[PDB]
């Protein structure tokens, strides 16, 4: 059905995420994302899960002086 | 309410098992057993709505169970 990049970018536009890099990682997808509002990042990951893309690795750390924001240290998704 | 009360009540509401909850001032370091990722995120969202932010999170998928993860690091901030 839809290619993963289409879903990822449509949902990134909806939830306010900036994609620095999207590249394959074996059969998975590695995403490099600019620092983000954690609530918006969770809403985006939930939308990707609804499109059949599970979160294989996620590591985030709060941004200094902005506790509700996080640096996305690692993000890897599985294809649908 | 004390942060541990909210954290433990909400973990039980989302089926998550806490095996260590260690205070570090305004930060709380947790050790959580492997979990359904959607439930883990729902718990963190409910904690955020109660004023407790996710300061550090590191998870990796469970091999052969893709919707599940191991919670390698979890630190919350009150």
- Domain with residue B67: its CATH number is 3.30.1360.100
Q: Give the Cα separation of B71 and B37 in Å (integer).
A: 9
B46 Cα to chain A: minimum distance (Å): 10
Strands, DSSP E only, in B1-78?
A: 18-24, 27-32, 35-36, 53-62, 65-77
- Backbone phi, then psi, for A56, in 5-degree steps? -85, -35
The structure was resolved to a resolution in Å of 1.5
* A contacts of B53 (beta carbons < 8 Å): 38, 62, 67-68
Contacts 24+ apart (CB under 8 A), A63-66: A63/A35
Burial B22-49 (b: 16+ CB within 10 A, else e): eeeeebbebebebbbbbbbbbbbbbbbe
Distances (CA, A) of B25 to B3, B10, B29, B49: 11, 20, 10, 20
Q: Can you tell me the distance from the alpha carbon of B10 to that of B25, in angstroms, rounded to the nearest whole number?
A: 20
Q: How far apart are CA A71 and CA A63, in angstroms?
A: 6
**CA A59 distance to own-chain centroid:** 11
3-class secondary structure, A25: strand
Q: Range of B22's domain?
A: 3-77
Cβ-Cβ contacts under 8 Å, A59 against chain B: 57-59, 73
> Nearest by CB to A49, which of B38, B59, B60?
B38
Q: Do B61 and A45 touch (CB under 8 A)?
A: no
Question: CB–CB of A79/A55 below 8 Å?
Answer: no
d(CA A40, CA A28): 22
Count: domains in chain B? 1
Closest CA to A69 of B1, B40, B53: B53
- CA nearest B42: which of A45, A78, A80? A45
What is the C-alpha separation between A22 and A25, in angstroms, rounded? Answer: 10
Question: Using CA atoms, how far apart are residues B59 and A60, in angstroms rounded to an integer?
Answer: 9
Strand positions, DSSP E, A1-80: 19-25, 28-33, 36-37, 55-63, 66-78
- Which chain B residues have a beta carbon less than 8 Å from that of A78? 61, 66
């Amino acid at each position: 059905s839809e290619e993963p990049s289409t879903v990822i970018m449509r949902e990134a536009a909806r939830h306010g995420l900036t994609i620095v890099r999207l590249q394959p990682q074996g059969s998975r997808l590695s995403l490099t994302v600019q620092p983000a509002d954690f609530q918006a990042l969770m809403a985006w990951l939930d939308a990707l899960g609804q499109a059949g893309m599970t979160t294989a690795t996620l590591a985030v750390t709060a941004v200094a002086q902005q506790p509700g924001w996080v640096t996305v240290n690692t993000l890897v998704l599985e294809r649908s």
